[PDB]
Write a protein that binds this DNA or RNA. Sequence first.
DNA 1: TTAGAGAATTGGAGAGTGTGTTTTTTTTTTTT
Lengths: 703, 95, 43, 636
Amino acid sequence: ESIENLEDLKGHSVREWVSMAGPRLEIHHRFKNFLRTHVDSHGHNVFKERISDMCKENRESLVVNYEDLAAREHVLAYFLPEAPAELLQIFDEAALEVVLAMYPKYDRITNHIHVRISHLPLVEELRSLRQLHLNQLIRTSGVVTSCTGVLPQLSMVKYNCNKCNFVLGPFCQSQNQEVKPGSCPECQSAGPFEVNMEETIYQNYQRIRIQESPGKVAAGRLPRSKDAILLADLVDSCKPGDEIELTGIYHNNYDGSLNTANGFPVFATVILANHVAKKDNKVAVGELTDEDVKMITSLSKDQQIGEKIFASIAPSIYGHEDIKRGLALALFGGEPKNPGGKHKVRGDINVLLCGDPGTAKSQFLKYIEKVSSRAIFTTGQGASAVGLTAYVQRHPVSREWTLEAGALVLADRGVCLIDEFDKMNDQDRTSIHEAMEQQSISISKAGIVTSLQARCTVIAAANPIGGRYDPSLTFSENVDLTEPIISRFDILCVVRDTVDPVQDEMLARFVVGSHVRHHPSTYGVEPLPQEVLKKYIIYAKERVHPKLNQMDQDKVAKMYSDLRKESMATGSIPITVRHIESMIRMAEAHARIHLRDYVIEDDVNMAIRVMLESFIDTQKFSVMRSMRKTFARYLSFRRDNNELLLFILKQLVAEQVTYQRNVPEKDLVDKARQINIHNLSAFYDSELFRMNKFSHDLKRKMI
Amino acid sequence: AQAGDKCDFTGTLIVVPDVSKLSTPGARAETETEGIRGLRALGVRDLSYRLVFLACCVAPTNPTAESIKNQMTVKEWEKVFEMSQDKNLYHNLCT
Amino acid sequence: NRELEALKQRFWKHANEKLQVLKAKLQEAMKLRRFEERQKRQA
Amino acid sequence: NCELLATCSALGYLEGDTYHKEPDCLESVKDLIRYLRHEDETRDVRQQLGAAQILQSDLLPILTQHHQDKPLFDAVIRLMVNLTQPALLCFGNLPKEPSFRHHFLQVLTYLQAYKEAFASEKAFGVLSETLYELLQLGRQEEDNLLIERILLLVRNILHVPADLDQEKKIDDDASAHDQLLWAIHLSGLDDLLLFLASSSAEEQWSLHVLEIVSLMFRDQNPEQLAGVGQGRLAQERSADFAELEVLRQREMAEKKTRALQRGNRHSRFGGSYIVQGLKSIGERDLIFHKGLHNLRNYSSDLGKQPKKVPKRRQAARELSIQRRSALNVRLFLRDFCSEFLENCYNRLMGSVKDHLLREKAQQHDETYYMWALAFFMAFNRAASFRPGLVSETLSVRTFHFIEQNLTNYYEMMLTDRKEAASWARRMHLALKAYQELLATVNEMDISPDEAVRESSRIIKNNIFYVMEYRELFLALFRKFDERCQPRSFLRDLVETTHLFLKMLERFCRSRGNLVVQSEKEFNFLDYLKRFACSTVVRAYVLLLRSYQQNSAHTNHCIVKMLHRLAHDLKMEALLFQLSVFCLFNRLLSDPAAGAYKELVTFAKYILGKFFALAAVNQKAFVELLFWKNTAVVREM
DNA sequence: TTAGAGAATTGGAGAGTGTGTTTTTTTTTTTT
Ligand SMILES: Nc1ncnc2c1ncn2[C@@H]1O[C@H](COP(=O)(O)OP(=O)(O)NP(=O)(O)O)[C@@H](O)[C@H]1O
Ligand SMILES: [Mg+2]
Ligand SMILES: [Zn+2]
């Protein structure tokens, strides 16, 4: 059989070389070995795990990282950008017969597997593409401006003879011209032919136009653009408005239309795609590994996970712990539901940050834009009603009316960030009512009558009247927003830059510390790393769906009723059900933060606390004392419950010592799981059992 | 060269045919003044012409750390060094 | 010129087409592979 | 493909500037030789190995860095000889069908690549060092075999046609052949070739060394080569500027003549005229449409196209154009000619003629003999002339040898139809050698030595006494064909005929020379009246058509012979022809007519004689139309 | 030995075939 070789030395060109049988077989064997022997830094066989995660979901597409392909097999990384079509075909075959070794019945699911190359280091600016890059693998970035529909393209076509029954054998379709038979071998009739529509093999096709991102280099200049072709599983990888990162072969062909347009032998160009990522969706649940899931689920075991997550939001901002808490609950979000299959209620949580200048509200919005996937940002007069919701336009080539996505539709399962919300026009600001509650955008324009989905969490920032918040007035008395728009915000936040010299010293020292820490070169818990937090959020929003079975209905109802009573006398607006459902959503969000499948009393207490503290913040400064006493005493500011566990421990020890004289941690937690006091960890981190000389050990379990 | 720039171009004025009128073995034709006639490639059509400036060079008409390190000649190095060591450079630069 | 060179050093302290670079730095590793194969065969 | 790829890749790997060979590389090259010996008729293994560039990639590094491994080295030498074998030998003949001609072209392309690669000086350095050791040793069958294969490798690399589409290179830019010659010079193998030619101990290689020298000199001609002094570069700079200046001025003048020919109004500026005194092809007068400025110099073929003459009727054309080699290469080649003429010519040429006598030479090696006989004799004539250095080929035996070869090539040209052009090229070589011998016997009369003057008179007496050297020119003119022979052949033939008739005139006018051949009486004008034939004047006029492109000496020769034939023999009416009169019309209407004083004066003389005859009678116009035999005496 | 008449081979001119060909409504942003 054909003999193995040193690959990198040859007299041929690279394309000719890898086309020859000997080196083709050697490349095939090398890539097979690379797939079956590559390991992570920790020693995990990477591609066994990736192939199993592919064959479970039937994704029929294997993503490979160049930055370790180069580490394992040098010459394959050498030939890949030089002869990408040939090497990628060889990689596809090798990957297919590796996958059919791991899962022998997978040919029932798919007969062909595509190797998709990622993290290609030879990135190129979109306007910097030249003739030097032709027929080579490139990586570019840009915003998708246009997409065709997903269309069937011929791939292996059989032609019925124009005068008889015979099928002329398969022709491999190209992207340059429609392949044709000429004349039939059974009888040499010629010219037109019929495609056998049943036996012909088709492939998915989608042509997209991408241009430079508006903020990248187009500083008043017009942006350059390129066409790209997506084939097979790469279709529907992107939509218009997506900031994609595209790897593909820069391919060119003769175009007579361009020749007559320019008066020169000018060849059209197109990118044959090989991988599509997105620069906002830097992490996705379809890309999470078993180790990521393991370390996420290990982090959830920590009782401090709520505090860690709250401290992990915008860690370069001092203080504003209530703001970080509310933003965490909105960032994780509640659970949507439809009881009875006839009555929808939203799961998403809306936040409004009101306050005076220099208080990091816009900075919070920018942080949320950076951390969260599918996020968008807009400001004041820059936004419009039509752009926020959806717009109807003459289609560029068809010239028929077409509906197009606005802000809240492009963020249909993300976050829409609206900075300086008080300064919008009323016609712009009232457009988001349906999107904020009914989570649809209904359009009746130019013959289009349809409703789009807008399941978006709106987080907004604003200043009060005159810029400076005055504590002499209620929130409603100085915000200038109306009740229908205020009540749609689940969480109301007030930030005030009041003078307090010790707090000013702490804040200023932290700000100077941030400035010296981030040179180019209230937390008390330490944050998570932001990469870990992104993985945690994207895991929790998909792999967890908190259910509700019991939440102490009479407690919440009593709380809501006297909250309505107190609000009737003052200046913030708990419209009837929206605040009840805000509490339900916040309890579900807290359960999601803890990765709980079912909502518990602690989550309900947290939701009640958030609602009541926000409501107390909206009161006049003189009224806060009476209001805070009213809700704090009766309505469940459940700080801690150490006394019951102290006397339970003392009772159990008294009985045990009496028994001994005439595993105690197990004895303690048995009575603690019998009585509704199950969160025993607070008792162990509290001094009440310590000055009673009790202590704990997870190994010995003696106390 | 970008739009709005005032630039000096050097090259040659060339004549460019109406390529839409020419058929060839490579590719077919793609179809107010008269134009020329009689070529085999042109067929029965008539070929018009237009003037194009084939620019071999472009420059303005009036003109990073690595870029600074390369551009700074010895006189400029000495000048910026003397300015950095200039006492009361504050008031000197203000004036 | 030592102080001027020190100013240049401070400037460089603050100071902080690629297919061919890739090919060269990779061809170094392939040269290493050839050398190691040759040594192992000749040993 | 796969087995050949495996076996060739098995040989060795190249690291930077060094080559490391695998232990079984000897058996690998033996396998490659085995595949080459069992090729298909398409030369498939040669094609595949050339495509793989295994010669450049592996064999040249092995030659230049592992020549100490002798059993590998000789196998590598034989393999390179087989790979570099010329395509005409590979296929037997130039093919005539598309597929095999494509195969020929592919093999030839890989030969271009091999020749480009071998210009690296280390290859010929190793070859020259090896052959130096071998000739010091010279003796064994394997040793002389290795000498033969080294010489055949040098022959093979020298003998490839240059692909002048890619070698589309200007006046004295170094071609691939120039770089190869410079590599030979730097390696010192030229000194070994000189040693082989000068030494009497190994004369069997003299024929091969003659072939090597004949392939070294291909672009060059001796008259230009001998004049390359050390200060020639500055002179050629000024000459290039002057030539560009005159070319540009000539083009500007031609542009202005065209501009004044057409009007200053645009093309569609209409208007039509009738020329009342000029009948059309019908009965009515001609209607003219192209304007008064086209009428100012009216011609009745302004709107017409040329005729498509068929393939079997088209004239032959020159196979080369005179690009000079680089000036350093020209200096080296002049020095090589000097050393070859001084140290090597007599012994080598005697040895080659001895090889022809022994009849072990190949079927056309006397073409190389006659090439050298032309080239180095003409080199001796240029610059300081010395017959002593070149005495051997002045023998009458060489004249007889050239005459029999030329007549044999002439007969084979007239009979061997399928190969007639190559026989014409061989006859041209023989004619050039004959011309140069006429030149040197002319030259030595000017020398001051009485002994060589005696030798000159001896040679002239026997050569003009023997008739077959004399009648050969009439034979060549009578069966000259433009369809087979290029214009350079006719130019050389005219120059040779003028020189021969000049020397015969001088000999007969200074000495009696009363008998020829069995003696029979002889006079000079009797022989000159043989050239008063329609075919001869037709050929001379055919060369006269290119008077602008002809050299000044060629114009002098052609007008001198035609003026002799018209005036002294009193046969102007033979030259009365209408094509000849069109030639005279273009000559007289030439803007550069002042540069051709002898030609225009001769044209006016013959035209005046014609118009005298026309004034005598109207029959001259009809007789002017058709070529004419000895019945021309009616007109005279 | 040289030149003209009868027979053989191949170029291409011409016939036939196949194919190609301003003005109104509705929206959106910005200008006053
Ligand atoms: N507690 C804080 N910690 C760190 N930086 C802070 C803090 N408060 C304010 N800043 C800084 O203040 C600057 C302004 O932030 P920004 O988000 O624009 O404030 P703002 O709330 O939007 N004020 P305004 O736009 O007038 O309503 C940023 O550089 C913040 O980092
Ligand atoms: Mg702000
Ligand atoms: Zn059929």
